[PDB]
Design a protein around this ligand. Structure first.
Ligand SMILES: N[C@@H](CCCC[NH3+])C(=O)O
Ligand SMILES: N[C@@H](CCCC[NH3+])C(=O)O
Lengths: 307, 307
């Protein structure tokens, strides 16, 4: 059960698509999950950073984790992002998530409302007993680097599957040398993480677009060449904060509606044209969907604040 | 009125005290507010960072604002923290906060779920029309520095009261030379901010403990001696992230119960022993409360995760 998570090499942090009024577009979401499955993704993160979980009510969130489990749980591992900057919120979400059948939880350290190292331990130890758990470190978002010390302290739990690491390949290695399963959370770094730094795989953004190529990158030996060729795409996705790019790109491919929940807004026209070129360089047949890529007009995009 | 907010020199980011089970201690809260009033604080932030708004549910938060307004609104300015990383949350909370009678809103940029500069503008422009607003920049917590460009863009709203700035004094001056009201959000920098860098005042943590001395620091001219005197307290208070220090200090003074909402945990015995001596050197009479400062035993502290 923890071992079943520990073996996953490709996890997609799935985007969450919306209807024109802001509510979840379940029909679109299901088609994305399907496409991920068809191309070899072994797990999904539901409502991750990429999934705009930060923009969900707990409501929506648990419902989505549950829908995903009920429709797709036999085919793919479901990792609910039930983390919080608040311990109470995390305990309660995690327990509801596991109750609706999720396979694991993703847990970030408390963002914004930063705690002490002792506090991190208390926080993690309060949810770790609930099930298989992946700890999320991303200091550029949270304002706090989880030190390896904390990680080893909590790794005394049998329920810890591993870390989602964003600090770099060098940290990934501090961990993988010391009996700790790591997935890279940086797409631009993940090839080398896997083949040179001991990472088990990726929890990927880029997977939402090119799941087959992402799997290729991780399953079949070193391939710096394939790595180099997807890199222009990766750079585009991260120019602005994720998931601004992915949301824009999924709309251009026609697999989601051009609807954004604020505070996210689409990439400008110049970027979108650029996307079309990036797509043709790589080959459209490698991206999700069947439809011809569009540039889209600014007026196509809907921004929702009240939903 | 925004001009009423712009003239405030001393704002306290008031702490939120708890009952043994984790619920708000309103009796202790009212008493902290009164203490502030008696020493001449001109405004409070209800559920700011220091107030652990991050650990509140929305019903709690709004209730606390509405309560503060009802009980103390004629005698102190009430600024609700109705900020959020989610635009939706911010819209609903802000409108509800203004409807119950708050004087201004405190708005942070979206933490953790980072957006673009264009997203930033859209986010702030959703709430700005609602009433007087203080914008909150603390990139050490949020992962993102609000660039002055953004602030100038939003400053087209007449409802912009000013900025709570935590980046430093140089940034402040950049705003103050350019027609923008600023309050320093750092206590170790607030004296010099006000007298040398054009800051209108402080939004203070330390005023929770020593309100009179902070008023003196900001009202009665340059005083390098008093500033040097409070400085050991200010250092102690920020050694671990705020408000771990404050929480433990107020409990040592006996004005709150030694109850923590997770993920915060108290400072350890040696640091508590050290607070006792800092109190001695400044004089307990400048501190809030009437009780003898205690060290407290570890067994005294109550950590709550489900509340
Ligand atoms: N916007 C809040 C609540 C999100 C809760 C659902 N995941 C936060 O990021 O903490
Ligand atoms: N922990 C959540 C909920 C905040 C509740 C209202 N102050 C957040 O920081 O966004």
């Amino acid at each position: 059960s923890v071992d079943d998570i520990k073996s996953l090499r490709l996890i997609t942090a799935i985007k969450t698509p919306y209807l024109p009024d802001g509510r979840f577009d379940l029909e679109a979401y299901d088609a994305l999950v399907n496409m991920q499955i068809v191309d070899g993704a072994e797990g999904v993160i539901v409502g991750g950073t990429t999934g705009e979980g930060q923009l969900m009510s707990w409501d929506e969130h648990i419902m989505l984790i549950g829908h995903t489990v009920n429709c797709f749980g036999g085919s793919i591992k479901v990792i609910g992002n039930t983390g919080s900057n608040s311990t109470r919120e995390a305990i309660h979400a995690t327990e509801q998530g596991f109750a609706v059948g999720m396979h694991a939880a993703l847990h970030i350290n408390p963002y914004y409302g930063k705690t002490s190292l002792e506090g991190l331990v208390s926080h993690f130890e309060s949810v770790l007993p609930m099930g298989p758990t992946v700890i999320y470190n991303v200091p550029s978002r949270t304002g706090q680097d989880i030190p390896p010390g904390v990680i080893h302290t909590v790794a005394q739990s049998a329920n810890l599957a591993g870390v989602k690491e964003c600090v770099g390949n060098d940290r990934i290695k501090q961990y993988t040398d010391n009996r700790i399963v790591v997935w890279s959370g940086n797409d631009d770094q993940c090839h080398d993480a896997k083949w040179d730094y001991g990472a088990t795989g990726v929890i990927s953004v880029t997977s939402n677009l090119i799941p087959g190529l992402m799997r290729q990158l991780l399953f079949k030996g070193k391939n710096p060449s394939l790595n180099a060729k997807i890199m222009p795409l990766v750079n585009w996705l991260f120019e602005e904060p994720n998931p601004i790019g992915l949301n824009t790109a999924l709309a251009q491919l026609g697999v989601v509606r051009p609807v954004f929940r604020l505070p996210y807004v689409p990439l400008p026209l110049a970027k979108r044209v650029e996307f079309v070129n990036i797509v043709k360089e790589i080959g459209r047949e490698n991206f999700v969907g069947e439809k011809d890529v569009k540039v889209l007009d600014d007026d196509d995009f809907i921004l929702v604040g009240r939903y």
